[PDB]
Design a binder for this molecule. Structure first.
Ligand code: AGS
Ligand code: AGS
Ligand code: AGS
Ligand code: MG
Ligand code: MG
Ligand code: MG
Ligand code: ZN
Ligand code: ZN
Ligand code: ZN
Ligand code: ZN
Lengths: 376, 670, 298, 566
């Protein structure tokens, strides 16, 4: 008899969490999977292995249904025919291939059914080499990450992450003349993600968090202790650091039943003589905050602040790609050299600072977009 | 035992019985007690049979579409499972529901022995349109397991394709014997006959399809810009394709905000035109079942802009409502509220309850929402009662909040910012469509906001070239484009509400009004109302304002004001049914006021002299004030109120006519 | 560097109603005839199939007049067009035998089971050799005569594993039809099948050439084919005429069952071949389905 | 034998009976005359290929069933209409048949005209009327009507094979030599062709919905209807809604219909040595117009003898009555823009602009411009835009453009890429659409300097040069220019000169014949009557306007006066 195979009756996704370095130290085990590699160090001899890469996420595609096996129904025999798909393209089955139509002289016609076919939630992400990982005089390199199943939407642009996955080859993309032999593209099929900075929305009152919170409370003097420990290599500036801590926390977001909104985010300007280490304070805050984006007055242009309409080729559609303010959404935008900015960026932050939106009406686009940044 | 469609949990017989019992036995009091609304239960609306009444009126008007609120299914006890089956399996459940509607249609006339003929009912095809199927989840938050499920999306329509013929029956003719057959499409596939079916003629490859003899159905693709309730971290707005079919084609225009409910579909896309190889990554879209264009929170569309569209809606029999229905009791309430002596103050006070005072600004905003009467000449001329308002002010004057409220309250306006917009992005442009790789025409912000209010924040910061676009919009309510793609005249009947700051970012009493506003006279003359919103520091005013802002944060969720639903429907009724005309007593005092302010302009730029557009603005504001009080004539007191609002908006009483300066203490009352 | 996608099916719905001319229904009717036929009180064909599997004789001997007693329509189909119906009954025998070849050896304490051979005997009217006609072409004929020559056994391929010359694509061909004479009705493919299949994702203009496949003989399987010559009996021959004869082909268990000089009845298909005397003339021959020795020499 | 269409046969008999039996009573006398026999005997004189049939006349027949059957299934019943017309012509005028002459039936005067957005899929194959603005027109081209082929191995000639839209080849081959049906070749010389033109039309301005962009439609003209459509005018097309294959819809969402060949009655063998062909069913709606009529672009031929013959005698009497008036000039200058109060000099200039001057050429070849260019400058709200809006509404072949919304290619002519296909096209700009007319450019100061360069190239040269990509062309730009400008700073400065107030280029300023500076001066009396006039307009709509001449008779007088060459 013919059964539905176990691939067609599985409701679960299976992932491999890497063994920790600390647990590997106990048993004198040397873990290749635990050690975070840079993008440069992932060579061809790591293919097929479970490896961990640390880096900043630059681009994340939208979640799309990638078909793993296609289901067809035949009216002639009543069978359901399934064809697996493991490539970017497939040829659909036209004429029926069950055992009943194969022996019969009249073969049935297959009609594909979406609901009986199996799909995976699919995302393609780019991870970039971190600045400390890049050697001297080099440009950071990038790696493709394939995200399937439950792990989708766990990667966002701008996150510094440890992505553990299986390093796998892909069919060659590029000009045919340039290829020499059995050249392959590479990607990382993601298995596990650990965030270097934990998001505030992802916070949950787990048991282990509670004792640390109670310890910090029972130590007492929490406000001054947290403020003075923000940038401790900077001497003094206690009130500045207190306002920076209030910047990190912020007030409550106010919603009126009429729909009118009053922002809970605090905006802080630090203006002073050169050499007061306020750039150091911005970098300290802006590494502390999980969604902190550091910008320069003229290094960040207008299109690098708001948005740009660009084509995404993996999902094959034109999408809006955010600037620095979108990257710092529900975070802190870290604007150094504030007086050096041009007037267009000043209008952009002028709309951002109160309405928490950016309204763009150009030839490319007619949108409003959420920019809920607290601005330092 | 129990027969179940493969891949579902749906039994056809059980679903038919449950839905028929729901149709026969549902009352709206079940919906009220579901929503925990016990005090709002009344007898004459609830205890009557609801869907029986709609079936009766649907037979009487001859319509074929039934609008089903899916929340009502969850209200009824027996159809609680049917709600989840409709969400999970709309393709089978909707067909079952259509069959049940047809059965109830024939049963209502057989049982009551009505004079309606059974044959006319039987030939009709009845279909139900479910809506309010759940929360408007983000479209990008949907997973592949949500394919072929019913979903809700809020969105803004950017553009739509022309009507596409989708083949349903294919017509084949034999080349040798002229024998014709018609084959009906099966799941997107038409089987060509290899040989002629006639006993006399059996020539292979002799059946040729005739493209114009065969029948087609209407299919339209609309690009919708989603506006979800919840937006995650760092998400940019995205546009989704939605497909409408048959009567729903061309129901949605560009620039309107709609509630779409439909099934979440995915298809594979051919990688090449010549090849049959498909791409493994699927393309997602929504097959639209129902469109809602009416919100109780905001106003409805101005019907003078869609008269031909309403006629074509009646021709197409789409049975989609652009306007909310006005019942007799709420119309009586509208007539009773219009009889109040404090109607102007009550309506202006109920505009923005969160915004404290700004009474004259709120009065001007309310008159802009009402608008003047629209006059179309039989010769061909057109006069529009669109009121343009400028709010020039100091920082912290709630004018951004006012533009936000107006943007929320209008049916189809657009909110833009200074230096966030360009001249091309305001009028119209050419883009490349992702699906077709074609050059497609797309409306700019001003054309999208036609029939509504275009709000422009930071108007003073906008460039000269971009502000020079607004001249034709403000005076003729249209834009005359002569570019490579289009040479045409586009209607932009959008009232403009602009917000601005002075040059020094704060009002300087040393400089005159014109220097503080810093607008060219051609642009500033086109504004009907110019508001100088000033910050005067007082004990009582600052105390009251501080108390007003601090009462907001007493609780987590915060005189007498009208509710926003009643406000919107009252303004809607007044715009739809009141078209006031100018009388002799209004005409003479309009002329006297215009002559008087021209005489005031004789004195020695420093001051904004009176202009003919100010006479036009007096006419429009008087018509708006007459339309507010439901009066069909403009008489003297409405014109005096228009003149008073014009004087008080720019604070003409506070300023010195000779110098043009404004002194803060000697007249001003905050 | 990915593997093949897999195509597989599972029965879900009832489908269209079965048709008598469909191959599956004919196979099912043949299977029911094998399982349920009673001669006097015993299932003779089922027990015969079990005994043949025990002796490792992969063939079934079926009396044709029993098919009269069981079901007329499939007898008519077998008589009118045997070339399409005989593979179906052989498939039915092979399908029943698989149930016997699993449920027996695993209980009375890898194995590959070939397609069984249909041997069928008839007691009906015997056509004389010179009364054969064009109306008998491609139909089962029962006829009598004397065998004057038996050839040596030739080796035909049933299963052969082939490999592309330079491409090294590996393929297998299974042959269950050996009825043809002077013809390779099944042969090696004219071009490599790796490109049209597109089984691998990499797919590393490359053309392997005409006839690129090579037979791997150590993994190929073969059977025996024999040529016989049947002559009309010399007792009834016209005086001035040379006696007329026919070339016949037998395979597998039908070979080496008769010596020259034996008078036989033969059930077989009156068939056609072209030998390279008339623009369109074909030489007749018989594909032997059953041999009956009228008398047995000692 | 072929099977016939019985409903088509009844349609043929009813239509051929209609071609004789229909009659009307004479207006002048009351004689019973039958208009379509008169039509056929008139075409027999002048060798016309086209018969014009009124739709109301066909609708009068029977109870209206014939008109409904013809309109609903026009594509199906059209060959029956052709056969009926051929038989009726054979009965009366057999000489028309000989040169075989291809006959075309043009229907007109349909009861309703449909908008370009009212086009739906249920009307495909039906007679219908649409209206639209012609934006692009193509070269007259030959279309393969009746092809001639030779079989490749027979090599005998066959002819008169009908073509059903896309190119077809015969599979019959009545020559007994071959046994192959598919293989043929086509010769272009012996083939018979028809005239073909594709004209692109656009939604009219008043027909456009509230926020939508205008959408276009490609309508095909054949036979005598070719070249009756011109870019920039409003045309009413009567014809059949057809459907055209479209490969564009490949990436669109939704299930696209496909067409497989059915394999149920084919006997097969697995002898060995499984490919089948499937074709896409993706289409777009087009129009095939049998009749073209050009509605006036306005809301409401150089020789005067040609012009007076078109007018009836009663209207010629009214024209000569207007000519006979001694105060005709005062009536004309008061009839220009009655919504505007005052400004008699601007009305004089606008009237002279509409009349224009004569175009003269020297022996050297230098052309003297007869067009008069007017520029109106002044203080804000001096009714400058009212003049331009009146001119574009009243004057024929007139376009209204804004300075900011215009572009250099949008004003003169643009080379356009279509569907990313290798062909390039030219679409006429604003000055070409207003050729021998007036181009109204509002907000002239706001226009870009490069656009000013691109327009005064046409202002001296009276022509537009195209050298972009592979298209080189010289186009006519014989247009008058009515411009409205605002001075620098908004208000007109009395202290400065005209060049100081205007930001426009000096080559722009030199070509303007008249500069009308309208100043705003606040006087009590003039403001009083102006305010009274404006409020009376708002109060009384059309009847507050009292011109000496209506728009139609003013336009008739201007069209008469343009024929004179002083
Ligand atoms: N209070 C402080 N404590 C510790 N280091 C300090 C302090 N003030 C200045 N510095 C050091 O002095 C240098 C000043 O660097 P910056 O952070 O660039 O100062 P700055 O305020 O940004 O000056 P700019 O960029 O010219 S406005 C750094 O090396 C700081 O570490
Ligand atoms: N009169 C007022 N009534 C109520 N709330 C007020 C008032 N004035 C200020 N606020 C509050 O203060 C905030 C200041 O924002 P806005 O007044 O909207 O800024 P603005 O008036 O647009 O001036 P800008 O941004 O400098 S042009 C508002 O969001 C309110 O919460
Ligand atoms: N003399 C006039 N007669 C009639 N209406 C007038 C007159 N002067 C001004 N108006 C009206 O005042 C308004 C001015 O509109 P426009 O014609 O656009 O002014 P304009 O002269 O074009 O000045 P700009 O450059 O547009 S600011 C319109 O409503 C006119 O109908
Ligand atoms: Mg610094
Ligand atoms: Mg603001
Ligand atoms: Mg103007
Ligand atoms: Zn099948
Ligand atoms: Zn036929
Ligand atoms: Zn090979
Ligand atoms: Zn031939």
């Amino acid at each position: 008899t013919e059964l539905f195979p176990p691939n067609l009756t599985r409701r679960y996704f299976l992932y491999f969490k890497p063994l920790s370095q600390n647990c590997a130290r106990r048993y004198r085990k040397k873990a290749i999977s635990s050690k975070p590699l840079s993008v440069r160090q992932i060579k061809g001899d790591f293919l097929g292995q479970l490896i961990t890469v640390r880096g900043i996420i630059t681009r994340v595609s939208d979640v799309k249904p990638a078909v793993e096996v296609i289901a067809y129904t035949c009216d002639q025999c009543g069978y359901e025919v399934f064809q697996e798909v493991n490539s970017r393209t497939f040829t659909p089955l036209s004429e029926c291939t069950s055992e009943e139509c194969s022996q019969n002289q009249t073969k049935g016609q297959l009609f594909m059914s979406t609901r009986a076919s199996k799909f995976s939630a699919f995302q393609e992400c780019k991870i970039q080499e971190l600045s400390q990982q890049v050697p001297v005089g080099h440009i950071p390199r990038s790696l493709n990450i394939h995200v399937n199943g439950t792990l989708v939407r766990s990667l966002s642009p701008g996150d510094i992450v440890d992505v553990t996955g299986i390093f796998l080859p892909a069919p060659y993309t590029g000009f045919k003349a340039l290829k020499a032999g059995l050249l392959t593209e590479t990607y990382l099929e993601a298995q596990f993600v650990r965030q270097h900075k934990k998001k505030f929305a992802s916070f949950s009152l787990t048991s282990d968090v509670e004792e640390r919170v109670m310890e910090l409370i029972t130590s007492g003097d929490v406000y001054n202790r947290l403020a003075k420990s923000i940038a401790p290599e900077i001497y003094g500036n206690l009130d500045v650091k207190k306002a920076l801590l209030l910047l990190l926390v912020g007030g409550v977001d106010k919603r009126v039943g009429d729909g009118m909104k009053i922002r809970g985010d605090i905006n802080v300007c630090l203006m002073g003589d050169p050499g007061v280490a306020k750039s150091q304070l911005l970098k300290a805050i802006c590494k502390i905050s999980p969604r902190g984006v550091y910008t320069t007055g003229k290094g960040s242009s207008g299109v690098g602040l708001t948005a740009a309409v660009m084509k995404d080729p993996v999902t094959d559609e034109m999408i809006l790609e955010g600037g620095a303010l979108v990257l710092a959404d529900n975070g802190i935008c870290c604007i150094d050299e504030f007086d050096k900015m041009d007037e267009s960026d000043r209008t952009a932050i002028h709309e951002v600072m109160e309405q928490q939106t950016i309204s763009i009406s150009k030839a490319g686009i007619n949108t409003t977009l959420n920019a809920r940044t607290s601005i330092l | 035992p129990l027969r179940i469609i493969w891949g579902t949990n749906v039994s056809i017989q059980e679903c038919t019985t449950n839905f028929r019992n729901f149709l026969m036995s549902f009352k709206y009091k079940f919906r009220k007690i579901l929503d925990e609304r016990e005090e709002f239960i009344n007898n004459t609306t609830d205890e009557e049979l609801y869907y029986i009444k709609q079936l009766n009126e649907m037979r009487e008007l001859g319509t074929s579409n039934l609008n089903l609120d899916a929340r009502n299914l969850l209200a009824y006890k027996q159809t609680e499972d049917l709600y989840h089956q409709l969400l999970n399996y709309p393709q089978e459940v909707i067909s079952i529901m259509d069959q049940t509607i047809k059965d109830c249609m024939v049963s209502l006339i057989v049982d009551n022995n009505l004079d309606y003929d059974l044959d006319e009912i039987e030939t009709k095809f009845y279909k139900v349109r479910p809506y309010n199927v759940g929360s408007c989840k983000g479209m990008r938050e949907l997973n592949p397991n949500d394919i072929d499920k019913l979903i809700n999306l809020k969105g803004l329509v950017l553009r739509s394709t022309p009507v596409i013929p989708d083949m349903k029956v294919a017509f084949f003719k034999c080349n040798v014997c002229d024998h014709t057959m018609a084959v009906e499409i099966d799941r997107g596939v038409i089987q060509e006959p290899a040989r002629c079916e006639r006993i006399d003629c059996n020539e292979p490859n002799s059946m040729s399809l005739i493209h114009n003899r065969c029948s087609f159905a209407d299919k339209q693709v609309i690009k919708l810009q989603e506006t979800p309730d919840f937006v995650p971290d760092g998400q940019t707005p995205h546009s989704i394709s939605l497909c409408v079919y048959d009567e729903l084609v061309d129901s949605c225009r560009a620039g309107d905000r709609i509630e779409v409910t439909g099934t979440f579909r995915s298809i594979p896309i051919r990688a090449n035109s010549r090849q049959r190889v498909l791409k493994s990554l699927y393309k997602t879209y929504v097959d639209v079942v129902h469109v809602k264009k009416v919100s109780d929170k905001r106003l409805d569309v101005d019907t003078s802009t869609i008269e031909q569209e309403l006629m074509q809606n009646k021709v197409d029999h789409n049975e989609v409502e652009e306007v909310r229905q006005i019942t007799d009791q709420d119309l009586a309430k509208i007539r009773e509220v219009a009889a109040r002596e404090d109607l102007y103050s009550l309506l202006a006070r109920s505009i923005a309850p969160s915004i404290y005072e700004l009474e004259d600004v709120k009065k001007g905003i309310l008159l802009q929402l009402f608008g003047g009467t629209n006059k179309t000449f039989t010769k061909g001329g057109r006069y529009r009662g669109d009121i343009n308002i400028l709010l020039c002010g100091d920082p912290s004057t709630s004018k951004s909040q006012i533009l936000q409220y107006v943007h929320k309250i209008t049916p189809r306006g657009v909110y833009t910012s200074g230096k966030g917009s360009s001249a091309v992005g305001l009028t119209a442009y050419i883009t490349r469509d992702v699906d077709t790789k074609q050059l497609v025409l797309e409306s700019g912000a001003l054309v999208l906001s036609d029939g509504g209010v275009c709000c422009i924040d930071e108007f003073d910061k906008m460039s000269d070239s971009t502000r020079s676009v607004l001249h034709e919009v403000m005076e003729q309510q249209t834009i005359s484009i002569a570019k490579a793609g289009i040479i045409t005249t586009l209607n932009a009947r959008s009232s403009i509400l602009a917000s601005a700051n002075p040059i020094g970012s704060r009002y300087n009493p040393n400089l005159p009004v014109t220097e503080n506003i810093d607008l060219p006279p051609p642009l500033l003359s086109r504004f009907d109302l110019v508001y100088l919103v000033l910050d005067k520091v007082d004990e009582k005013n600052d105390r009251e304002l501080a108390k007003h802002l601090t009462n907001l944060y007493l609780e987590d969720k915060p005189d007498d004001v009208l509710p926003v639903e009643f406000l919107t429907m009252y303004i809607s009724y007044a715009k739809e049914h009141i078209h006031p005309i100018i009388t002799e007593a209004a005409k003479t005092e309009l002329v006297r006021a215009y002559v008087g302010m021209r005489k005031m302009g004789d004195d020695s730029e420093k001051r904004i002299t009176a202009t003919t557009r100010q006479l036009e603005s007096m006419i429009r504001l008087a018509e708006a004030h007459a339309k507010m009080k439901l009066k069909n004539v403009v008489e003297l007191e409405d014109v005096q109120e228009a003149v008073r609002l014009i004087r008080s908006a720019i604070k003409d009483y506070a300023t010195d006519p000779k110098t043009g300066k404004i002194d803060m203490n000697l007249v001003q009352t905050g | 560097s990915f593997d093949r996608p897999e195509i597989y099916s599972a029965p879900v719905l009832q489908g269209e109603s079965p048709n008598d001319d469909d191959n599956t229904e004919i196979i099912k009717s043949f299977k029911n005839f094998i399982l349920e036929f009673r001669l006097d009180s015993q299932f003779i064909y089922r027990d015969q199939l079990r005994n043949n599997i025990l002796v490792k004789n992969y063939s079934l001997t079926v009396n044709m007049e029993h098919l009269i007693g069981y079901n007329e329509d499939i007898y008519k189909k077998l008589s009118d067009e045997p070339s399409d119906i005989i593979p179906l009954f052989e498939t039915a025998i092979t399908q029943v035998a698989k149930r016997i070849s699993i449920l027996s050896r695993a209980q009375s304490a890898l194995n590959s089971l070939p397609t069984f051979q249909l041997i069928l005997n008839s007691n009906a009217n015997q056509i004389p050799l010179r009364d054969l006609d064009s109306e008998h072409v491609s139909k089962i004929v029962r006829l009598s005569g004397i065998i004057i020559s038996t050839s040596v056994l030739s080796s035909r391929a049933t299963y052969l594993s082939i490999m592309c010359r330079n491409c090294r694509h590996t393929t297998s061909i299974t042959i269950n039809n050996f009825n043809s004479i002077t013809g390779n009705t099944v042969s090696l493919p004219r071009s490599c099948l790796s490109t049209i299949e597109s089984e691998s994702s990499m797919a590393n203009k490359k053309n392997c050439g005409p006839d690129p496949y090579i037979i791997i003989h150590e993994s190929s399987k073969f059977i025996d084919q024999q040529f016989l010559k049947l002559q009309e009996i010399p007792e009834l021959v016209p005086v001035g005429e040379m006696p007329r004869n026919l070339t016949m082909t037998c395979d597998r268990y039908l070979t080496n069952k008769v010596i020259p000089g034996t008078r036989v009845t033969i059930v077989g298909i009156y068939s056609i071949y072209n030998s390279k005397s008339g623009v369109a003339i074909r030489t007749p021959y018989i594909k032997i389905l059953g041999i009956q020795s009228d008398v047995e020499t000692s | 034998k072929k099977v016939d269409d019985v409903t088509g046969e009844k349609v043929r008999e009813a239509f051929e009976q209609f071609l004789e039996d229909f009659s009307v009573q004479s207006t002048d006398t009351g004689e019973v005359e039958k208009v379509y026999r008169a039509q056929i005997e008139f075409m027999k004189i002048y060798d016309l290929n086209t018969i014009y049939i009124d739709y109301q006349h066909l609708s009068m027949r029977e109870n209206g069933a014939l008109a409904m059957a013809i309109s609903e299934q026009y594509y199906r019943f059209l060959p029956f209409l052709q056969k009926g017309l051929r038989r009726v012509v054979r009965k009366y005028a057999p000489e028309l048949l000989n040169t075989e002459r291809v006959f075309q039936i043009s229907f007109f005067n349909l009861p309703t005209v449909h908008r370009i957005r009212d086009i739906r899929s249920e009307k495909i194959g039906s007679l219908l009327s649409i209206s639209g603005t012609v934006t692009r027109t193509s070269e007259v081209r030959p279309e393969l009507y009746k092809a001639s082929f030779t079989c490749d191995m027979c090599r005998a000639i066959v002819d008169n094979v009908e073509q059903s839209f896309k190119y077809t080849e015969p599979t019959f081959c009545p020559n007994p030599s071959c046994e192959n049906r598919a293989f043929w070749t086509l010769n272009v010389t012996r083939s018979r062709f028809l005239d073909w033109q594709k004209v692109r039309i656009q939604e009219n301005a008043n027909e456009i919905p509230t926020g939508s962009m205008p959408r276009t439609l490609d309508v095909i003209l054949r036979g005598d209807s070719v070249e009756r459509a011109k870019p920039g005018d409003r045309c009413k097309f009567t014809g059949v809604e057809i459907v055209v294959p479209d490969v564009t819809q490949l990436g669109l969402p939704g299930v696209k219909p496909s067409s497989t060949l059915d394999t149920r009655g084919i006997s097969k063998t697995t002898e060995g040595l499984r490919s089948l062909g499937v074709r896409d069913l993706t289409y777009k709606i087009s129009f095939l117009a049998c009749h073209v009529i050009s509605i006036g672009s306005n809301i409401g031929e150089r020789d005067q003898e040609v012009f007076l013959n078109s007018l009836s005698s009663d209207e010629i009497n009214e024209l000569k009555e207007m000519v006979k008036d001694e105060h005709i000039y005062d009536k004309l200058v008061r009839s220009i823009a009655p919504a505007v109060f005052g400004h008699e000099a601007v009305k004089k200039g606008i009237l002279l602009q509409m009349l224009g001057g004569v175009h003269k050429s020297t022996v050297e070849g230098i052309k003297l411009r007869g067009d008069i260019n007017i520029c109106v400058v002044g203080d804000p709200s001096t009714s400058k835009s009212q003049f331009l809006k009146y001119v574009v509404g009243f004057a024929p072949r007139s376009v209204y453009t804004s300075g900011k919304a215009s572009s250099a290619a949008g004003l003169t002519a643009a080379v356009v890429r279509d569907e990313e296909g290798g062909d390039y096209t030219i679409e006429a700009g604003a000055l070409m659409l207003a050729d021998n007319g007036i181009c109204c450019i509002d907000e002239f100061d706001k226009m870009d300097i490069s656009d000013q360069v691109a327009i005064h190239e046409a202002m001296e040269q009276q022509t537009i040069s195209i050298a972009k990509a592979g298209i080189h062309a010289t186009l006519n730009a014989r247009t008058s220019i009515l411009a409205a400008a605002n001075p620098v700073g908004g208000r007109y400065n009395r202290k400065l000169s005209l060049r100081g107030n205007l930001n426009m280029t000096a080559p722009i300023m030199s070509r303007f014949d008249l500069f009308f500076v309208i100043l705003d001066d606040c006087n009590e009396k003039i403001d009083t009557e102006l305010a009274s006039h404006i409020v009376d307009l708002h109060m009384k709509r059309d009847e507050a306007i009292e011109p000496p001449f209506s728009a139609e008779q003013l336009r008739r007088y201007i069209k008469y006066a343009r024929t004179f060459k002083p």
